[PDB]
């Protein structure tokens, strides 16, 4: 038995695997915060009717591409209801961070 | 089984013995002989050979699809850690934007 996955260049990912169907869009940007800090702003949108549990976290990078130590930050759970959008945010852990990346994980069934 | 998606375009799937990992970039376009050339990069993030399929879809000023007879899903082989640029030319002058789509099958 097989399923399928389709990815778009805009960040949309859909999975269709037997009775399991998900369709989520993930994006993030950094905005300037105070005292030389950045603030990550992410958007996670479901485009499918059934509730979907997922987890997310941001990671941070400096000008060289090195990962910036981010103490006490782990994967956080969300239940996205059908067609719900959620906004997620994180303050940079130190002023050397120039960029963030948002990761989202979901269980395929 | 699970999937991980990133804001920089990575999609990683792990499902029993099935494993895939790729990154799909944003599309850029440029003018070319009265048409637009679309470009995207697909990057392997696995040390093993992968194969997937891709297609470009074109849109007009209002986001209506600009029908492209004949052109559909195409195969692409990616050696471990290889980076491949894929490209398409606009079918006609009403096309102003393009999106790149990538698909694969998953199993157990």
Residue A65 has which token pair? 């591409």
- Structural contact between residues A37 and A25, judged by C-beta atoms closer than 8 angstroms: no
Distance CA B33, CA A80 (A): 46
Angstrom resolution of this structure: 1.8
Distance CA A31, CA A41 (A): 7
Residues 6+ apart with CB under 8 A from B70: none
Distance CA B90, CA B21 (A): 29
Residues 6+ apart with CB under 8 A from B72: B55
Ordered by where they begin, the domains of chain A are 1-109 (2.60.40.3230)
B72 to chain A, any CB pair closer than 8 A? The answer is no
Phi-psi region of A10 (alpha: psi -120 to 50; beta: other; left: phi over 0): alpha
When scoring B1, B2, B4, B7 by the number of chain A Cβ atoms within 10 A, the one with the most, hence best to mutate, is B7
Distance from CA of A31 to the nearest CA of B (A): 15
In order of B38, B55, B61, B85, B97, the CA distances from B91 in angstroms are 11, 14, 14, 19, 12
Is B3 in Cβ contact with A5 (below 8 Å)? yes
Bridge partners, residue A13, by sequence = A7, A24
Query: If you measure CA to CA, which chain A residue comes closest to B20?
Result: A5
Parallel, antiparallel, or unpaired for β A99-107 and B83-89? unpaired
Q: Where are the beta strands (DSSP E) in chain A?
A: 3-8, 12-17, 20-32, 38-46, 52-61, 76-80, 85-91, 99-107
In order of A54, B88, B97, the CA distances from B62 in angstroms are 33, 20, 10
B25 to chain A, any CB pair closer than 8 A? The answer is yes
Among the partner-chain residues A2, A4, A9, the one whose CB lies closest to the CB of B27 is A9
């Amino acid at each position: 038995h097989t399923g399928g996955i389709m990815i778009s260049s805009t960040g949309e990912v859909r999975v269709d695997n037997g009775s399991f169907h998900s369709d989520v869009d993930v994006s993030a940007v950094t905005t300037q915060a105070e005292a030389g800090f950045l603030r990550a702003r992410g958007t996670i949108i479901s485009k499918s009717p059934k509730d979907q549990r997922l987890q997310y976290k941001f990671t941070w990078y400096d000008i060289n591409g090195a990962t910036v130590e981010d103490e006490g930050v782990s994967w956080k759970s969300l239940k996205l209801h059908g067609k719900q959008q959620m906004q997620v945010t994180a303050l940079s852990p130190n002023a050397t961070a120039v960029r963030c990346e948002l990761y989202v994980r979901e269980a395929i069934s």
